[PDB]
Amino acid sequence: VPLDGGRFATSDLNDLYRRVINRNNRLKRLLDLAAPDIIVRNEKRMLQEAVDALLDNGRRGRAITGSNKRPLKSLADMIKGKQGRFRQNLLGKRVDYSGRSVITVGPYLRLHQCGLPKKMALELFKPFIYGKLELRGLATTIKAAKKMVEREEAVVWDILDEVIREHPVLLNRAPTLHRLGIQAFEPVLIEGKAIQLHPLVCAAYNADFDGDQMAVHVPLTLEAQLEARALMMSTNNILSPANGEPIIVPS
Amino acid sequence: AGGITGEYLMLTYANDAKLYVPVSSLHLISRYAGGAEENAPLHKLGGDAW
Amino acid sequence: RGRVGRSHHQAYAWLLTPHPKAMTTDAQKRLEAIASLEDLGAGFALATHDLEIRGAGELLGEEQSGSMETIGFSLYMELLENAVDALKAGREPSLEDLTSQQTEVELRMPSLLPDDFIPDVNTRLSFYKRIASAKTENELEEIKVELIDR
Amino acid sequence: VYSYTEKKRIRKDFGKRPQVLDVPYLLSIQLDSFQKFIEQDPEGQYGLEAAFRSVFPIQSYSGNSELQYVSYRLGEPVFDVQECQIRGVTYSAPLRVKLRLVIYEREAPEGTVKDIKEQEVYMGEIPLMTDNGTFVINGTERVIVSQLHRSPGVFFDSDKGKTHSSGKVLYNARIIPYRGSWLDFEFDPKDNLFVRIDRRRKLPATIILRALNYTTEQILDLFFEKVIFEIRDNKLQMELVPERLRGETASFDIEANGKVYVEKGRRITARHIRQLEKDDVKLIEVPVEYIAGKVVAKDYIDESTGELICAANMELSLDLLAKLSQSGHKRIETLFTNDLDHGPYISETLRVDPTNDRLSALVEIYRMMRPGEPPTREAAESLFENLFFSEDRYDLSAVGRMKFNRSLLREEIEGSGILSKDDIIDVMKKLIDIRNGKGEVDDIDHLGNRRIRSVGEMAENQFRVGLVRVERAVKERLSLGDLDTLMPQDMINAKPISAAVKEFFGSSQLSQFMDQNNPLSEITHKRRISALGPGGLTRERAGFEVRDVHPTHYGRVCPIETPEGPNIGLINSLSVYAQTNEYGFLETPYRKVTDGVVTDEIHYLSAIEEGNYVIAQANSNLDEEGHFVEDLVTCRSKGESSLFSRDQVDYMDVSTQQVVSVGASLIPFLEHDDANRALMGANMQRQAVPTLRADKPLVGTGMERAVAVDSGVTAVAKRGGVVQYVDASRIVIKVNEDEMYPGEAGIDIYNLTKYTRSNQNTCINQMPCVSLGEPVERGDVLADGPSTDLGELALGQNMRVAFMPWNGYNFEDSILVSERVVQEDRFTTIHIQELACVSRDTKLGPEEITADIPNVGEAALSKLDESGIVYIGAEVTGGDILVGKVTPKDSSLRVPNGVSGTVIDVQVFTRDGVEKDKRALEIEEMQLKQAKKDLSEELQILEAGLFSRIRAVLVAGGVEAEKLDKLPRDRWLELGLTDEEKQNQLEQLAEQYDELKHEFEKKLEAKRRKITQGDDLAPGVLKIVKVYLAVKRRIQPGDKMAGRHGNKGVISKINPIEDMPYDENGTPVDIVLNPLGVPSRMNIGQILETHLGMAAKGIGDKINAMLKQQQEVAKLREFIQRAYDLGADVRQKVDLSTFSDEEVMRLAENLRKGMPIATPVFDGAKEAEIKELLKLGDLPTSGQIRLYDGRTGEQFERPVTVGYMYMLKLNHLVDDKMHARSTGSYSLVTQQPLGGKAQFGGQRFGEMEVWALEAYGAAYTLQEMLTVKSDDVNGRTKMYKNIVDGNHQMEPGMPESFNVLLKEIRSLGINIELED
């Protein structure tokens, strides 16, 4: 990838590959030339060391480095550890149709709903809005619907209040210790900027309102919305899975 | 000068870079000759090679 | 070290160094390397060690030893093949021929086509040929307008 | 007693202890350290002088030349501070050394001179600390925090049976140099003794014993005593020492001189020893079984054959004894070992040591330090010489030698920097002594063992690192040829000094970006004590014992102000009165207690000395004769607080606030909070945004003024006088005639920094707080900074708070806020962003910044000018174009989506050599007008000053008022007057005037060249335009706001005025907190501050009432005097009778909004005084009044608490946090969404959140959130089309981050594949 200064990034894998290819081509030429054995021997030693550093650098007591005197990132170092593929890209991964905001109380809510700012509810629910606008024919393409949502005429708010009718969103607090850490709530649109959270599910989330933040994901398909409504709504999580005691205790 | 206290002559070249010459070897020094005791130039010590 | 020896007499070679409080680390590395390889046939190993650290310079420039972002050999053979085919087909003389009969106007003031201006070395070379071979000011002006356009 | 501008508003100080030592300059450590770096030290032991004299004279290898040093001098900086920040260049001063190069002549005897050439050579640019303690390194204002590292010396620690599972304590010793290679000794669980160097492989200690030209005999004499056998005619006569037998079980008959003293098997009692000595026993016959296990000291060989019989360090047996008898040996010497008192801990090391000589010992040392390269003699010997005994590559500092000679109980606190033989031997002796049972181990967390190296020492170390490379290069250049035409300038390189210093200042772990959203945050980030950085411990590998608070932290390091989270107790902050010792250690003052009197003399004691004495408590009652009123006074003797007798104390604490920091001494009623909640109170006080209209705290601690003055945000008068001119951007002070100077009299001019941007994007502007024609004195504030108010810190507003639950709108920690708080714009804060647009130089040529941009209408270009840059004052919103930039084939800078604000400043930088567009010429043109105008106003206000002094000095001897103005104001020299000291002074003033003319001319021309010149930029950029946006963030549900006592909570509703609980007078409560936050987390300080604030506003309300209906000053004076009394024996004692009857009308004008109160932290207002103050006002003394509901209008049962609590608005807005993403960009190597708010990022549905969906049966939600919504590209394009087409359904596919895993595993030699 270019570094935007005319040069390119280091990208340690290509560095290791260039090292291996250079040593290998040199050794092939030197074997073609029938060079004496003292030279081809340390050529093969260098090639073995280079392929060694490519496959897994640092498994030798010696590790070769580039900048800043840290060893390069080999193909085995791109799988191991907290930053490998398994723990950072496969078991848990970044997600579209998601948001994050501060939480306030909103004690007028019922147990099965959560506040949701109008801005977040418009940004998360854009494709559904495009579909409903093209159903009304108010913009008979996706480009005109895009500008139409961007301007925010008075009609897209009605499109929200229809596409948010029976559509749960999954609220999630950051250390999701237990399965009551992620729960689905029907949204209630708020002219504000903070996700209001029913003050009974705070004990389940372990959420004071002293500056916490919660993420909001959207279930898309019918299977996901029914999973949210049947399994993950807050009106199903009353007993704690750890022990039969209630978890919607008045706090 | 690293263990000896001596008396020196004080000579100011260009850029105020001073040259001290010993009084034991003041014969290396001559008076001016161009008739320009007010219009005399000033060289730079050590040249301008650098 | 190779100046001594040269005959059946065993020949010693001393590398006196200053006292080690004022030698850089690279110096002791060099000295221990050159004292390690005290054998016969060590020259080529030492040369291919000097390469690989120093790195070969430009394949199509000056500056023999250094990394310094050369042009690739795989690119270079293609560039040279394009030059060979254009040259032979065209049959223009070498640039040096255009240097030979050149009435020397060495005025030691820069005169070339800059790299970023015409990046393709082959095409820039073709302009060199066609400019120095232009034998009419009208031809020079045609070169000027074509180069302005291109 | 009072000034003129403290009588504006006198904070009513409660508190009873009279202060004996005022709070020092709060930035003493930073300014003092960097002064010790850059100051001409005559004695030559601090800073640059110490470094230069530690390197120079540089003698060449040839010896026929040397380069010696004369003096050093810091030049003037090329730019001032403001131009350094704006232009993006560090604020440095060129260091110029007057080097002097001698040259010897060859054939002369040893030591002569041919020539000597000297020249002021330039070397190094050293960044200059500003007036406060902040450096400017690249335009960004940095702060180098002090570091707290273990002092160089020697330490004897022991893992408390953490290994070997036997309960065996493995005592160890570390010799830790300031600079060099460490050294360690330790004990194997077999009670051996091994050395290790630089944490390498472990070796027997006797290896390094032999390495010092010690053979085995001297080793045994060093570590062991002697027991003497004399073989005679009767069976091994031994000279017996009776104190060698204290405490052993006997083994045979103990008799002498024909009398049985002790019999076998007995323990040798003390009375047995006394019997032996009173009978004076010397010589005892002993059996032979006693010697079969004893080890002989030295070598006894056979004299005739010259063959070894017995050697050093081996046990004697019967055959050896017979041979030594047969060789004529009469005297044998064995070792006095033991089992509990003197173990043979070195003899077993000799046994296990596979080394017998010294050369081979140096051989395996060489093998250890560098594997490979098998040793020679000279290489091993030189390696071991320069490893520990070279002043080049090893150095204990003077602090190292001090602690070293202290730990070994030596005498002199001076010595050589490098180690010696006796030092290593003494360390080993002391370690063996610790092992035996005498002496005691150290704790490594003691503040007598950890020392502070602040800015000066650290930067001097880097300067020395650079100077070593400089002197090496100098030596090579001297030994090279052609000496007789060299000059020092052409000899030294100024690269490795500037590099070694810029590397430290710019990019280090201890030179960090200044927190600048307060005066408090700056002044408490400069007084920071980081326990991290180079030469210190690591954040996530620090245990529970170093994070913890030691009994020696008292007075030096604050116990409460530390961050919470992963680095707690590692980022400690200094106490108020703590200083740095001469050696870097921490010391705190103490009042000396004489025979019975607590005096007023103070002694600064360190942490080692504080343990020996006994120190009284800060608040222990003493009464006008220095005598404690009790006889069991609570003191602390040796890290143990306990009650001591009155006639035993040696010292007393200076004041009650020397335990806590500066951050946690602005908390009023700190002595009622918990420690956790006070920690959070301090750390959130550090983050309060400076609001729009600053508002004094009605309840402070009096330390507010110190923080406002010492943090350099207020513009403070350097010399007193009269304010000649006030303006919102400048203040002109005509200085008093007795504060004048004779030469360059002049008058002072202060330029106030208007709305510039702080580091944290808040707004720092100063406001004039003095009026036109008003007397000011030296040290008095003239301009409030950000969040100060008449020279005292005011971080937030103070609002009327009711403590009750309100319909659940303040459920957990939330806050319900009235709408007057948002109507009055009291939490509306200004945030100033800097958006930069750069013009690159890329393929297909550069980019211009013209207005000509495609596919956008003229509405887009309506806010740009003709040059493509937005107009100043243009109220932009999100998505508008500020700098129209084109890509050569729409790369215009746009406001980020969501943020509004007014453009207040456009800075255009251009690289030299390319022409400047229209906007750059316009900006440079107005800048030139500003620069010429400001210098002209400077010179002409100085003209007013000089001519006023000239006119006012001629009152006698030359006064003719018309003749001053018969000719114009200039020619006031050649008039008729006596040519005496008056005309002397007029000639001096005219010469000063003409010099000021010349200075103005030179400065104006230099400023013009500095403005017009092109500036250095990054290679590859053409021109940069920085637009500045000012955004008034008001307040909304979400914005976290806090108190001072650790009670945070996001505002949860902006509630109309009429719904707020009003009391019987109609006044609505401004903020309704929750009571339930008080009992659990015990910050009772908030309730007491609430009551005291209600009292203060009661006094303010009565003064306001007495002022509205106009009443004479004889009533205001009476009431205000009653208010300023009423302390129960407080130390304030202000009398209103000496006020000028109009500064009472100004005092009561400033007190009409509330009478400010100080409560020193541990010397606070007791509750009785609070009730008395609430009763001086007409408020009900229980603190709680009756509130009617806002909506139903019917009174609340159980009367509620209202008062005035000081709310800060912390810098966690909800504008910055709230974020949402539907579809956006995607990452490159793995096709997952990007991450963050700057990028249009999507939240991370991590590992725990996947287990939380596996715990439900929600498998379809999981499948979409890890294939469709994230990663499966053919799945997500189809999903988007299906959503738009009204069909919520997915085709899953398989995530591309798993195909990446296949190709990466499969790209090893590992065939991983999917089956059928």
Place this chain on the structure above:
Amino acid sequence: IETPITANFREGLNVLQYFISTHGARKGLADTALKTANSGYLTRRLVDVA
């Protein structure tokens, strides 16, 4: 410590009682930080076995 803090929070602690209070109440927060770091790993191990 043998002698207690005989002063509640209605009345004020004096200096030395407050210092000993901090002795007690920083161990709590340091313990909270590192126990959190450990228990996260423990529940990760538990999830991955079952």
Place this chain on the structure above:
Amino acid sequence: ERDGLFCARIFGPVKDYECLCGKYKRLKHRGVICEKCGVEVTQTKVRRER
């Protein structure tokens, strides 16, 4: 380059449905291999899997 670490005939075309030398620039020739340089003009996402 021709047969370097990043390559177009070995791993695939850089731009979507386009030859290396621009001989074929539209999807109507999907699958044909150019002759001068020798890339398979196809989707550029095959550069991820080859």
Place this chain on the structure above:
Amino acid sequence: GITKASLATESFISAASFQETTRVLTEAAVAGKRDELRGLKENVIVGRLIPAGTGYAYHQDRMRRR
């Protein structure tokens, strides 16, 4: 123990995505191991339905179709 009882699993992905990835991959690549995707973690890895809840019916009929 739970650290060893999870590395000693018949599924070489439910142990590779746990700790010690290099050791697990080499020991399961020499042995030529086979993962039947019969768990809740490797179905998360390979991006298909979890055999727990609403994925249980799917996996039930999928198994009974072969």
Place this chain on the structure above:
RNA sequence: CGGAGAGGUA
């Protein structure tokens, strides 16, 4: 995009 480092919220 990577690397190093600093700090902060829950």
